């Protein structure tokens, strides 16, 4: 199975201070897509059929 | 984005006040959070 996060992201390092820094998500570059996972239909069909 | 309305936002562009290195000055910075991370009140 293959899982991906299409949204290539930006880290924004805002400083709460004095030595403590919070990391915030910056603006997205590219398209707005949602994460997803792929499972080989053939592999899953046989695997389920062997379990049943 | 350019959304019909079935995308239900999901991603939120939040702006807020923040404490800087110094005590005196506030910080008006913005971030990005998922809908499952935030909740609106009233």
């Amino acid at each position: 199975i293959n899982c991906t996060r299409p949204n290539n992201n930006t880290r924004k390092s805002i400083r709460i201070g004095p030595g403590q820094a919070f990391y915030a998500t910056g603006d997205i570059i590219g398209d707005i897509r949602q994460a997803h996972c792929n499972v080989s239909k053939a592999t899953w069909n046989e695997t389920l059929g062997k379990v049943v | 984005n350019n959304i019909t309305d079935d995308m239900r936002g999901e991603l939120k562009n939040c702006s807020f006040n923040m404490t800087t290195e110094l005590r005196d000055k506030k910080q008006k910075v913005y971030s990005l959070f998922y809908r499952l991370d935030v909740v609106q009140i009233n």
Partner: antibody
Amino acid sequence: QVHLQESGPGLVKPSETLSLTCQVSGTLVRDNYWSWIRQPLGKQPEWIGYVHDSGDTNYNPSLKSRVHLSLDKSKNLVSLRLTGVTAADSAIYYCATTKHGRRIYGVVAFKEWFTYFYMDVWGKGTSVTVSS
Amino acid sequence: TFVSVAPGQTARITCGEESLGSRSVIWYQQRPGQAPSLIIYNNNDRPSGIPDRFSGSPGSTFGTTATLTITSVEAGDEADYYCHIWDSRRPTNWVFGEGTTLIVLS
């Protein structure tokens, strides 16, 4: 093919209803998309909106509550309507065929594909002066 | 805006804002006193009748403006060129970008 001919009044008083007609020749009005584009003197063309025979039809958000489009399948022509005209509507109105396309960038199942329109066949156009 | 290019050279035209997402830029050419004509739809796909001298920048580049390249500049190419931006991140543009006039130096 395909010949298009626009026809209108040419002069409109303010706060009135401008009516234009786009005579279509060489094709049917039912099997194609139709768009209107106006262009002021010395300005960039502004899209008014697109209309389809089935009933699919969208307008310009800036001129949404003032414009009205329709298609006559019996006479095979296009008709534009603009209520509440001012001096800003004084431009050259063109009628033009419209072909659709689909730009896919992500995974089609999740949507993330937007349909883009483009005009290929233009008409001569009609000049409309809305000066009181 | 104006762009003057020597005949036979290469002309380049910039229109609209910087790309924020995957685009599908539609180019149009307007001869003075005539109606606007289609040149390149879908970034760099030219329809029938249009020479391959006209090429457009691919709409997969993020952070760059749409670019129209015209090789073998001739006097007949001297006109107004407008562009229609279709970004996945921006709403539908009901207004063409500010056009650019091509000047043949002869």
